Amino acid sequence: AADRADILYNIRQTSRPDVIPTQRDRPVAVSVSLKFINILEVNEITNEVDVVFWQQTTWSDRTLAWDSSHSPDQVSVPISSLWVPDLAAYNAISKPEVLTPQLARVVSDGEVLYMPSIRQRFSCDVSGVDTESGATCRIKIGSWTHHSREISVDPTTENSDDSEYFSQYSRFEILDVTQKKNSVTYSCCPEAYEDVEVSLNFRKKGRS
Amino acid sequence: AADRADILYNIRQTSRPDVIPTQRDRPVAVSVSLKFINILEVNEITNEVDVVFWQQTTWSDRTLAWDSSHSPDQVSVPISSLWVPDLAAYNAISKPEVLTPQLARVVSDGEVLYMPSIRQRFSCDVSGVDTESGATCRIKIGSWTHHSREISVDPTTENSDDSEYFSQYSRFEILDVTQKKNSVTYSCCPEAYEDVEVSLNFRKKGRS
Amino acid sequence: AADRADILYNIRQTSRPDVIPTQRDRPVAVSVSLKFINILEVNEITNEVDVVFWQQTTWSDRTLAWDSSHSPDQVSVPISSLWVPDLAAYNAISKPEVLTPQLARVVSDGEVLYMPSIRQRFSCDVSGVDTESGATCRIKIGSWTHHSREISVDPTTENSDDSEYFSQYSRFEILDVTQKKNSVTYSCCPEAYEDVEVSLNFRKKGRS
Amino acid sequence: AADRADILYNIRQTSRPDVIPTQRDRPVAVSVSLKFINILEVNEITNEVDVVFWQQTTWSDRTLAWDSSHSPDQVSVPISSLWVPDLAAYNAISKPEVLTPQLARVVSDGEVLYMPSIRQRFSCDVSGVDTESGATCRIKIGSWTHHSREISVDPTTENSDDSEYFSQYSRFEILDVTQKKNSVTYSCCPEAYEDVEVSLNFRKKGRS
Amino acid sequence: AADRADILYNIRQTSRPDVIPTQRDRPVAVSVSLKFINILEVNEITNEVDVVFWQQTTWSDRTLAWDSSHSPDQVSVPISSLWVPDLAAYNAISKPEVLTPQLARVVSDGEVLYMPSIRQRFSCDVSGVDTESGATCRIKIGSWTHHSREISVDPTTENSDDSEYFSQYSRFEILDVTQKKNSVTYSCCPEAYEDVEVSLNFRKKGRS
Ligand SMILES: N#C/N=C1\SCCN1Cc1ccc(Cl)nc1
Ligand SMILES: N#C/N=C1\SCCN1Cc1ccc(Cl)nc1
Ligand SMILES: N#C/N=C1\SCCN1Cc1ccc(Cl)nc1
Numbered sequence A, B, C, D, E: 001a002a003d004r005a006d007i008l009y010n011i012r013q014t015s016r017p018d019v020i021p022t023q024r025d026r027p028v029a030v031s032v033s034l035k036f037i038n039i040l041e042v043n044e045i046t047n048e049v050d051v052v053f054w055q056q057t058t059w060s061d062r063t064l065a066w067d068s069s070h071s072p073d074q075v076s077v078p079i080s081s082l083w084v085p086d087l088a089a090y091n092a093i094s095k096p097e098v099l100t101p102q103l104a105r106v107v108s109d110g111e112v113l114y115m116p117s118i119r120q121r122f123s124c125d126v127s128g129v130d131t132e133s134g135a136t137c138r139i140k141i142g143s144w145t146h147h148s149r150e151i152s153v154d155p156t157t158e159n160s161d162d163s164e165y166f167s168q169y170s171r172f173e174i175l176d177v178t179q180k181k182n183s184v185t186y187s188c189c190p191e192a193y194e195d196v197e198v199s200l201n202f203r204k205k206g207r208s
């Protein structure tokens, strides 16, 4: 029977923003899917590209669930009130530029959806952008401090159109986008960190 | 008899900045109206524009109302102490740069007016900007996380001149500006999100 | 009987930074006078200017008064501890860049002086900058959300040289500066808002 | 029997971010190791480079130690909640830009690991970058305010690869990176401050 | 018998960051000495220079004093926990870019030292930079809101090398550095404000 103000007030009491909601000591499964909106400044010479995309991030936080029999089953909450995967583009050369309100969608069962529009610059393979096969820029996104046992990242497998969200007014066109999964590991640290490798195949429009 | 201090103190007591002020299941009615102030940069090749506009935003938050029969019926309040629509430009390629003091005007009847001066960059149709008929850049603005059942957005038609606020020193000129209501929906999300579609018809100024 | 630490204490106990210190229900008299220090990146084709100035701002706030018969009559105080006029340049195209500590000077009688050095870009008339008559760039500054009945702004007329503070190293030189008070109103809003119009007549320094 | 929520609570409640965690009267032993990921901009004329590197930083704080007999032995914690070494690149000409979530890992034994990905500009020898022997840009990093008696700096002792983390799409390549321990001192200050002189020997990729 | 935590806690208990540490109506004596590290982005046409210096700043607050006979006689403390002179470069045209941790050194006798490394752009005389006699760029730094009877500044003119800290990889070199005390006053304000005028004599490097 509680209103929306109550659902939020109760989230502040149960939600520990700095505590990863690990349950039955099993990694938190984070789903990550980049919705490409536009490809801006491209420099084949320096192998750098500016990209705008909506990062659809979904996961479950047990400590957030509530009874929605006699009340709203969803509310928007500031990400500062909840725990959020500490994801990062392993090959980014600029910090992520969040262009939208930093609010996440929370379902009464604990399901969380955070989908910010992000603009960011990447260090990838730009060669071939001005060709028919185009270039394929690969973006590695995974947790920065939570190894495979605390966080698992998997791409949301859905055959949705690759350029469904892509701006028609962009100078470039998307040929294909494949989001695979991997597990990076270095000599700095023993364990392995999961990541989703998003390969963006694009090229310039209006070519001869 | 009460001063402005009482009105503010009262707002700090009832205002819930992180909770949408909806009554029943009826969504919050947000009115959006853009007053174009300047068109700074335009790129015919990349289809990008840098513009300055005043985003006239109004809505109702009855949980803020107060008795003004013997006190001011309006006060300027910092937006941080109020709930504000999580509006965003769906095709912006830069974060909104707010140029003015972040204060809203609150009327004793619960009405809220927030009109910031914003400089922002968009990806839109720039073709024809050098012709007499000009270019037509469409800017879509709507709630980012609140679907139609939660937030409604509509323009504000009138007999106002599209150049009433426009700078005469700009390199461009406005031909016509029409703001229509529209709705967006992606395969990411089931429900639909209302948005105001602002069509800016402008061209570069001639030796005239 | 009191020291600078006690003054600050009492100030923090009576000052209401988010409440305009209305006196007798009359509008707060705000005085503003720009002291030009430099003219930097000028562009006659885009009618854009980048200038640096000290914005001399004064007003009265009775709620800050204190007896200084045998105590300091003046103290520097962070602006966050005081109410400040929500002033904005109506034709600015970049946010004000405050180059100095944000401290204000408060006198025991309630007089407040805030004079920050600001770097900011404006949209204004730059035509003729490289001619002998020079260009005349007009900058409009006034309250953003407080109308005439709440705040009043007038140029702090004081016998002084137009380039008393102007850098001798600028590529440009000031020919004249006239600061006149005015008023603005739009079909958006019923009441009027006061502003000060600063006309900066300048030109690129010749050679021979 | 305590979970991560309990551990995080304890750490946050025990950590003293402003107090150097000096065990006994010995200095705090900090280990620093730069893992270069890219060399973005290089200017031989101005001897200035723009580089992206992960700064492996480790130290100990016994106050955070907890019993992990039947509890996690590592947790992610925001650095704002921990004391962190006040490291500064002595030859940096721009503030370090942290591109990743500012979280550190704290082991149950009080061991702390913080490894952010940082983009920063340095003033260093770039002459010879376009030769087979390449250029050797040396970067000095150490405590800014804690001398040898309070903080000691040593390069992560380990025979590792220099290009392991390096981007294959960079316009440059790494020939060698020798990170040697060192010390600095000036007439300003009588004591000595330890640092880690990192020698970056790199050159531009051949057109082949 | 007091650890560094106790020294900080005492400081946190008596320090008044927003209150100048005045002693018997005498002005606080602040010492300022710039150590040049690099000279970059120089423009003889616009008379603007980018400079990087270690602004050595010292003053005294004897209320923070403690007995260090058998306790550390120095501690590093965040400036946010201390009162710091509101110093400003009068002819700077960009805000100060602080490149180092913002920590100060408090000594057991009440002395405080703050020496951040700063990168800032200035408006000054750059003419003659490419000549043997080089150019002389003057930089003024003094209190922004505290007049002569509240704050006094003087250069720590000692017997040191002007290029002791100066980078050998800079395109320029220092011929001489004279740091003299000085004062300023404008029609705006009745009292005078002290400042140290640093005359930097530098020229480009040209093996000829
Ligand atoms: N393997 C490995 N290392 C990885 S994968 C993603 C980030 N890292 C390095 C790292 C690991 C832990 C911390 Cl606190 N900071 C940086
Ligand atoms: N349809 C759809 N999706 C839309 S319309 C406007 C924004 N979005 C995406 C979205 C939806 C929900 C959240 Cl919490 N964040 C982003
Ligand atoms: N007329 C009019 N409108 C003016 S004059 C100066 C600023 N404005 C717009 C405005 C009016 C009210 C608020 Cl809360 N915000 C912006």
Ligand SMILES: N#C/N=C1\SCCN1Cc1ccc(Cl)nc1
Pocket: D143, D144, D145, D184, D185, D186, D187, D188, D189, D191, D193, E103, E104, E105, E113, E114, E115, E116
């Ligand atoms: N010698 C010397 N000085 C050094 S080595 C590393 C930094 N410094 C300068 C310094 C020393 C102390 C403080 Cl509080 N701030 C800056």
Ligand SMILES: N#C/N=C1\SCCN1Cc1ccc(Cl)nc1
Pocket: C103, C104, C105, C113, C114, C115, C116, E143, E144, E145, E184, E185, E186, E187, E188, E189, E191, E192, E193
């Ligand atoms: N003379 C004079 N005025 C000076 S010297 C250095 C700064 N100023 C102006 C000033 C004076 C007082 C305040 Cl609160 N803010 C700025």
